[PDB]
Design a protein around this ligand. Structure first.
Ligand SMILES: *[B]([O])([O])[C][N]S(=O)(=O)C1=[C][C]=C(C2=NN=N[N]2)[C]=C1Cl
Ligand SMILES: O=S(=O)(NCB(O)O)c1ccc(-c2nnn[nH]2)cc1Cl
Length: 358
C-alpha cells in the first residue's frame, strides 16, 4: 500500500462517499499490475455488516464486458463469426427486418434501434420470440448506436448456442473458472449469501429483479478481488493460458465503430489515451451514454490499442459500478458501490485517481 496510492484513493473516494451518500464501497487499484484494495461502510446497514474484500456487489452492465469476452471466446473457438446473420443461430427469426442484421450489430448496439430494456411483460421464451419478430428498426443496420440490453443480451444468448451450454455454464467454464474468478456469479449461491451486499434505492434495501436476458446484459455479481483479477486479465491477456480466452479478450477490445471520441468494443468501450477527462466524464452521463448516435464503421476493426482508456459503467436499481484501465500503463481501477449514483461522479473519481498514478 504505497502512500501515494493510499492518499489519492482516500482523498478522492472519501468525499465521493459523503457527497453521494453511498452506504458501502469497495475500490481496487491495479498499479504496475498489482492490486490494492480499499473498503468503506456497509454491505448491509440493518445487520451492520461491513464491506470487505469478499463482499459481492451487483455489477449491472459491467456484466456486458463478461458477455463480450465470452462471445469473443466463441469466435476464437470458431463456433460463431460476427459476420454471421442473427438468423443462423435463431432460425425462427423469420421476419424480414432481420435480413442484414448480424451478430456484430447485436454485440455493438448497431442493429437499428433495439430498445434499452426487454419489455417487463416478456416473461416466457415465446414472448421473447414474439418481441424480436415484431420489433421494427428505426434505422438501417450499422448506421446508429443505441445502447441496449435487448441487443447485446441477445448476442450473448446466441453466442453460446453452438457450444450447447447454457449461458451460465458457458460463462462459468470458459471465463470464470480459467481466470480463477471463484467468487463471481450469475446466480448467487446460498453458500455466498452472507457476503451478498444489499443495494440501496430511496433508502430501501433491494436486489436485482429477474428479467429476460438479465444474465447476459446485467446479471453478474462479484467481489472487489475478482474484479481486480478481471482487470488484470483484460490488461494483460497474453498471460492467459487458455488460447481462445486470450483471443476473446483481444477481440472484445477491438474497435468496431466510432461515435465522437469513443470506440465500441464487445461490451468494453474505449477512447484513445490520453483522454480528455471532460470527454469521458461528460460522456458517461446517461444523457449521452444512452442516446441515439450515428456511428462510423471502422473497416476493418482496429485491433486492441494499448494506449486506450478502456472502461464500462454498470447499474442496477441498488448498485453502481465502474471499471477503467489503460493497458499501456498497466494501470486500472474498479469502483463497486451499493447505491446507483451518477456516472459522471464515477468517471471523475476514476480519472482523478488514475491520472495521479500514471
Ligand atoms: B446497465 O447499463 O447497467 C443496464 N442499465 S438498465 O437501465 O437497463 C437496468 C436494467 C435493470 C435494472 C434492474 N435493477 N433491479 N432489477 N433490474 C436496472 C437497470 Cl439501471
Ligand atoms: O479484424 S478484426 O478486428 N475482427 C474482429 B472480430 O472478428 O470480432 C481482428 C482483430 C484482432 C484479431 C486478433 N486475434 N488475435 N490477436 N488479434 C483478429 C481479428 Cl480478425
Amino acid at each position: 500500500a504505497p502512500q501515494q496510492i493510499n492518499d489519492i484513493v482516500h482523498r478522492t473516494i472519501t468525499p465521493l462517499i459523503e457527497q453521494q451518500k453511498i452506504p458501502g464501497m469497495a475500490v481496487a487499484v491495479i498499479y504496475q499490475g498489482k492490486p490494492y484494495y480499499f473498503t468503506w461502510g456497509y454491505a448491509d446497514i440493518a445487520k451492520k455488516q461491513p464491506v470487505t474484500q469478499q463482499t459481492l456487489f451487483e455489477l449491472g452492465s459491467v456484466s456486458k464486458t463478461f458477455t463480450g469476452v465470452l462471445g469473443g471466446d466463441a469466435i476464437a473457438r470458431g463456433e460463431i463469426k460476427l459476420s454471421d446473420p442473427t438468423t443462423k443461430y435463431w432460425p425462427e427469426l423469420t421476419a424480414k427486418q432481420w435480413n442484414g442484421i448480424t451478430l456484430l450489430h447485436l454485440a455493438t448496439y448497431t442493429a437499428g434501434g433495439l430498445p434499452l430494456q426487454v419489455p417487463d411483460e416478456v416473461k416466457s421464451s415465446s414472448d421473447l420470440l414474439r418481441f424480436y419478430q415484431n420489433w421494427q428498426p428505426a434505422w438501417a443496420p450499422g448506421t446508429q448506436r443505441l445502447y441496449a440490453n435487448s441487443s447485446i443480451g441477445l448476442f450473448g444468448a446466441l453466442a453460446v448456442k453452438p457450444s450447447g451450454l447454457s449461458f451460465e455454464q458457458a460463462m462459468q467454464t470458459r471465463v470464470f473458472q480459467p481466470l480463477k474468478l471463484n467468487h463471481t456469479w450469475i446466480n448467487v449461491p446460498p453458500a455466498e449469501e452472507k457476503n451478498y451486499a444489499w443495494g440501496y434505492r430511496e433508502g430501501k434495501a433491494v436486489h436485482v429483479s429477474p428479467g429476460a436476458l438479465d444474465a447476459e446484459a446485467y446479471g453478474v455479481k462479484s467481489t472487489i478481488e475478482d474484479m481486480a483479477r478481471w482487470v488484470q486479465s483484460n490488461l494483460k491477456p497474453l498471460d492467459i493460458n487458455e488460447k481462445t480466452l486470450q483471443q476473446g479478450i483481444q477481440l472484445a477490445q477491438s474497435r468496431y465503430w466510432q461515435t465522437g471520441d469513443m470506440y465500441q468494443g464487445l461490451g468494453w468501450e474505449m477512447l484513445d489515451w490520453p483522454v480528455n477527462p471532460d470527454s469521458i466524464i461528460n460522456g458517461s452521463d446517461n444523457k449521452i451514454a444512452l442516446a441515439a448516435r450515428p456511428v462510423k464503421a471502422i473497416t476493418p476493426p482496429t485491433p486492441a490499442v494499448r494506449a486506450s482508456w478502456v472502461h464500462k459503467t454498470g447499474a442496477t436499481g441498488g448498485f453502481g459500478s465502474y471499471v477503467a484501465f489503460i493497458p499501456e500503463k498497466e494501470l486500472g481501477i474498479v469502483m463497486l458501490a451499493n447505491k446507483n449514483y451518477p456516472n459522471p461522479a464515477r468517471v471523475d473519481a476514476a480519472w482523478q485517481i488514475l491520472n495521479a498514478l500514471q
